[PDB]
Design an enzyme around this catalytic site. Structure first.
Site, PDB file in Angstrom:
ATOM      1  N   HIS A  64      -9.968   1.417  -0.760  1.00 25.38           N
ATOM      2  CA  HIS A  64      -9.901   2.516   0.190  1.00 25.38           C
ATOM      3  C   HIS A  64     -10.669   2.173   1.497  1.00 25.38           C
ATOM      4  O   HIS A  64     -12.016   3.558   0.979  1.00 25.38           O
ATOM      5  CB  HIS A  64      -9.007   3.278  -0.092  1.00 25.38           C
ATOM      6  N   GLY A 122      -9.740   8.693  -3.478  1.00 21.11           N
ATOM      7  CA  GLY A 122      -9.700   8.807  -2.041  1.00 21.11           C
ATOM      8  C   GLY A 122     -10.872   9.331  -1.420  1.00 21.11           C
ATOM      9  O   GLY A 122     -12.205  10.035  -2.116  1.00 21.11           O
ATOM     10  N   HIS A 182       0.903  -1.209   0.337  1.00 17.87           N
ATOM     11  CA  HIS A 182       0.045   0.084   0.286  1.00 17.87           C
ATOM     12  C   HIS A 182       0.784   0.838   0.192  1.00 17.87           C
ATOM     13  O   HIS A 182       1.423   1.703   0.914  1.00 17.87           O
ATOM     14  CB  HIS A 182      -0.990   0.541   1.421  1.00 17.87           C
ATOM     15  N   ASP A 187       1.836   4.420   2.503  1.00 23.91           N
ATOM     16  CA  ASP A 187       0.713   5.570   1.832  1.00 23.91           C
ATOM     17  C   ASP A 187       2.003   6.442   1.423  1.00 23.91           C
ATOM     18  O   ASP A 187       1.821   6.812   0.222  1.00 23.91           O
ATOM     19  CB  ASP A 187      -0.418   5.530   3.065  1.00 23.91           C
ATOM     20  N   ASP A 188       1.849   7.287   2.119  1.00 28.56           N
ATOM     21  CA  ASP A 188       2.937   8.023   1.574  1.00 28.56           C
ATOM     22  C   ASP A 188       3.688   8.761   1.541  1.00 28.56           C
ATOM     23  O   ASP A 188       3.891   9.463   3.131  1.00 28.56           O
ATOM     24  CB  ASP A 188       2.011   9.748   1.100  1.00 28.56           C
ATOM     25  N   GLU A 204     -10.921   4.344   6.447  1.00 29.45           N
ATOM     26  CA  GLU A 204      -9.174   4.882   6.864  1.00 29.45           C
ATOM     27  C   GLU A 204     -10.334   6.119   7.847  1.00 29.45           C
ATOM     28  O   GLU A 204      -9.880   5.910   9.299  1.00 29.45           O
ATOM     29  CB  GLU A 204      -9.183   5.128   5.614  1.00 29.45           C
ATOM     30  N   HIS A 253       1.544   4.837  -2.360  1.00 27.42           N
ATOM     31  CA  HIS A 253       1.283   5.746  -3.581  1.00 27.42           C
ATOM     32  C   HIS A 253       2.066   6.153  -4.558  1.00 27.42           C
ATOM     33  O   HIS A 253       2.762   7.317  -3.962  1.00 27.42           O
ATOM     34  CB  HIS A 253      -0.045   7.393  -3.181  1.00 27.42           C
ATOM     35  N   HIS A 313      -6.417  -0.122   5.084  1.00 30.31           N
ATOM     36  CA  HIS A 313      -7.046   0.771   6.504  1.00 30.31           C
ATOM     37  C   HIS A 313      -7.737  -0.205   6.547  1.00 30.31           C
ATOM     38  O   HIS A 313      -7.406  -0.919   7.970  1.00 30.31           O
ATOM     39  CB  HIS A 313      -7.363   1.369   6.270  1.00 30.31           C
ATOM     40  N   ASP A 340       1.929   8.636  -6.677  1.00 30.14           N
ATOM     41  CA  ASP A 340       2.577  10.321  -6.870  1.00 30.14           C
ATOM     42  C   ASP A 340       2.392  10.579  -5.380  1.00 30.14           C
ATOM     43  O   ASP A 340       2.393  11.866  -4.930  1.00 30.14           O
ATOM     44  CB  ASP A 340       0.687  11.030  -7.441  1.00 30.14           C
TER      45      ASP A 340
HETATM   46  N1  LIG Z   1      -3.491   9.344   1.546  1.00 28.13           N
HETATM   47  C1  LIG Z   1      -3.464   8.959   0.162  1.00 28.13           C
HETATM   48  O1  LIG Z   1      -5.072   8.725   0.350  1.00 28.13           O
HETATM   49  C2  LIG Z   1      -3.796   9.535  -0.876  1.00 28.13           C
HETATM   50  C3  LIG Z   1      -4.614   9.106  -2.129  1.00 28.13           C
HETATM   51  N2  LIG Z   1      -3.583  10.139  -3.178  1.00 28.13           N
HETATM   52  C4  LIG Z   1      -3.875  10.401  -4.295  1.00 28.13           C
HETATM   53  C5  LIG Z   1      -3.853   8.590  -5.703  1.00 28.13           C
HETATM   54  O2  LIG Z   1      -2.309   7.688  -5.767  1.00 28.13           O
HETATM   55  C6  LIG Z   1      -5.249  10.992  -4.543  1.00 28.13           C
HETATM   56  C7  LIG Z   1      -4.894  12.121  -4.477  1.00 28.13           C
HETATM   57  N3  LIG Z   1      -6.188  12.716  -3.985  1.00 28.13           N
HETATM   58  C8  LIG Z   1      -7.389  13.508  -5.423  1.00 28.13           C
HETATM   59  C9  LIG Z   1      -8.320  14.036  -4.837  1.00 28.13           C
HETATM   60  C10 LIG Z   1      -8.485  13.295  -3.427  1.00 28.13           C
HETATM   61  C11 LIG Z   1      -9.710  13.289  -2.893  1.00 28.13           C
HETATM   62  C12 LIG Z   1      -9.025  12.592  -1.165  1.00 28.13           C
HETATM   63  C13 LIG Z   1      -8.106  12.427  -1.561  1.00 28.13           C
HETATM   64  N4  LIG Z   1      -7.614  11.633   0.982  1.00 28.13           N
HETATM   65  C14 LIG Z   1      -8.278  11.516   1.367  1.00 28.13           C
HETATM   66  O3  LIG Z   1      -8.867  11.461   0.754  1.00 28.13           O
HETATM   67  N5  LIG Z   1      -7.614  10.514   1.960  1.00 28.13           N
HETATM   68  C15 LIG Z   1      -7.715  10.935   3.572  1.00 28.13           C
HETATM   69  C16 LIG Z   1      -7.578  12.074   3.993  1.00 28.13           C
HETATM   70  C17 LIG Z   1      -8.339  12.776   5.341  1.00 28.13           C
HETATM   71  C18 LIG Z   1      -7.583  13.237   5.558  1.00 28.13           C
HETATM   72  C19 LIG Z   1      -6.240  14.348   5.938  1.00 28.13           C
HETATM   73  C20 LIG Z   1      -5.651  13.716   4.613  1.00 28.13           C
HETATM   74  C21 LIG Z   1      -6.088  11.963   4.254  1.00 28.13           C
HETATM   75  C22 LIG Z   1      -6.620  11.987  -1.891  1.00 28.13           C
HETATM   76  C23 LIG Z   1      -7.307  12.765  -2.914  1.00 28.13           C
HETATM   77  C24 LIG Z   1      -1.906   9.885  -2.588  1.00 28.13           C
HETATM   78  N6  LIG Z   1      -2.664   9.752  -0.849  1.00 28.13           N
HETATM   79 ZN   LIG Z   2      -3.885   5.527   0.718  1.00 33.52          ZN
END
Ligand SMILES: NC(=O)c1cn([C@@H](CO)CCn2ccc3ccc(NC(=O)NCc4ccccc4)cc32)cn1
Ligand SMILES: [Zn+2]
Length: 349
Positions: A211, A181, A12, A292-293, A214, A14, A235, A16
């Site tokens: 996903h 997401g 898991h 994740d990231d 989470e 990403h 998650h 990007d």
């Molecule tokens: N951590 C992650 O979820 C996440 C998602 N991406 C990319 C794809 O590989 C998508 C980027 N992206 C574009 C629109 C979009 C909308 C929502 C999310 N992420 C999301 O909602 N994550 C939950 C979250 C809640 C609160 C704070 C931080 C993250 C990513 C989004 C990268 N990291």
């Molecule tokens: Zn993720």
């Protein structure tokens, strides 16, 4: 230091979100975009976070950098290659990397993301490129890398393209479809576009992960299992809300892809509570440890073997339990999953 100096599996992460500041500075410079800063180390500290933020606060990070990577064929292929390189540093033997091909393109996609004018980089040849650097990194770096293509919750329109991408590029690394997401938008899981694309996945034998749980309720995990027919959960923290769905996933034994350090900087988990993973530990769940990231969260795999070794009492026996689970529940052909199980068993004893 490293909490675990043994090989690891990661499921898991990403693409990007595992870019090096350096390369962004580099393409942004040589394309015009102008970051918030011109040194490698001060871009990191405003594009990466260190205290829980909010969604909006969180999605701006991508609007710093993604304009300087997307669009450019060269960059797309670079981050794949360099992704494999930085995973080797983490001690990973096998890794599944995920990303949305549409968000990396500036043509044949509507709307065009990030804010870029049209061009001639289409989702289709974006994944081909990434495929290239990925296979290139694999044989240059010695890490086995497979790909996962992500559907976007808020854009069911792209979903049917993704499945096609997954099928056309099956073998060429890509092994499954994903969903994310922002799983709080109402009824996104049941978006016709999504559910029928996942139905195509099942028909064509494409592996499936989602996903869910989470930052959403246990109902999002439910519709992921019973409707989207997932084989793995991204998650899946909130399925502790419904004890019968939990006991049932104990029993089907499903894979949870845990991301400990991610769950704090997002808010999914509040500190003054169980973490969802201690319970997966005590309960013998099938689960993994994942990053994740790495860019946005200033981290490496080792930051969350560390956080679990240090604040939650993981010992190395669970560490290795959990990487053999991760290998078992990988989207790898029956034979290859079995050569990867062989390596790890011997490396661990
Ligand atoms: N951590 C992650 O979820 C996440 C998602 N991406 C990319 C794809 O590989 C998508 C980027 N992206 C574009 C629109 C979009 C909308 C929502 C999310 N992420 C999301 O909602 N994550 C939950 C979250 C809640 C609160 C704070 C931080 C993250 C990513 C989004 C990268 N990291
Ligand atoms: Zn993720």
């Amino acid at each position: 230091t490293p909490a675990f100096d043994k090989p690891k599996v990661e499921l898991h992460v990403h693409l990007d979100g595992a870019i090096k500041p350096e390369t962004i500075l580099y393409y942004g410079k040589r394309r015009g975009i102008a970051l918030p800063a011109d040194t490698p180390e001060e871009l990191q500290n405003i594009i990466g976070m260190d205290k829980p933020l909010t969604l909006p606060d969180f999605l701006a990070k991508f609007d710093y950098y993604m304009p300087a990577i997307a669009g450019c064929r060269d960059a797309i292929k670079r981050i794949a290659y360099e992704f494999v390189e930085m995973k080797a540093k983490d001690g990973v033997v096998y890794v599944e990397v995920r990303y949305s091909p549409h968000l990396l393109a500036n043509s044949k996609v509507e709307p065009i993301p990030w804010n870029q004018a049209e061009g001639d980089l289409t989702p289709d040849e974006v994944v081909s490129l990434v495929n290239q650097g990925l296979q290139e990194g694999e044989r240059d770096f010695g890490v086995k890398v497979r790909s996962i293509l992500c559907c976007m919750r808020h854009q069911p329109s792209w979903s049917s393209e993704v499945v096609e991408l997954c099928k056309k590029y099956r073998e060429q690394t890509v092994v499954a479809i994903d969903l994310a997401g922002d799983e709080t938008i109402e009824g996104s899981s049941l978006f016709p576009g999504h559910v029928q694309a996942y139905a195509e996945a099942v028909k064509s034998g494409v592996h499936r992960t989602v996903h869910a749980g989470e930052v959403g309720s246990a109902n999002v995990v439910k519709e992921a299992v019973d409707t989207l027919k997932t084989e793995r959960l991204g998650h899946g923290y909130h399925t502790l809300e419904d004890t019968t769905l939990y006991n049932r996933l104990r029993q089907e034994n499903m894979h949870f892809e845990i991301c400990p350090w991610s769950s704090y900087l997002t808010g999914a988990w509040k500190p003054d509570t169980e973490h969802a993973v201690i319970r997966f530990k005590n309960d013998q769940v099938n689960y993994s440890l994942n990053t994740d990231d790495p860019l946005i969260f200033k981290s490496t795999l080792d930051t969350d073997y560390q956080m679990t070794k240090k604040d939650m009492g993981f010992t190395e026996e669970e560490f290795k339990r959990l990487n053999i689970n991760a290998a078992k529940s990988s989207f790898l052909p029956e034979d290859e999953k079995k050569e990867l199980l062989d390596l790890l068993y011997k490396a661990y004893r």
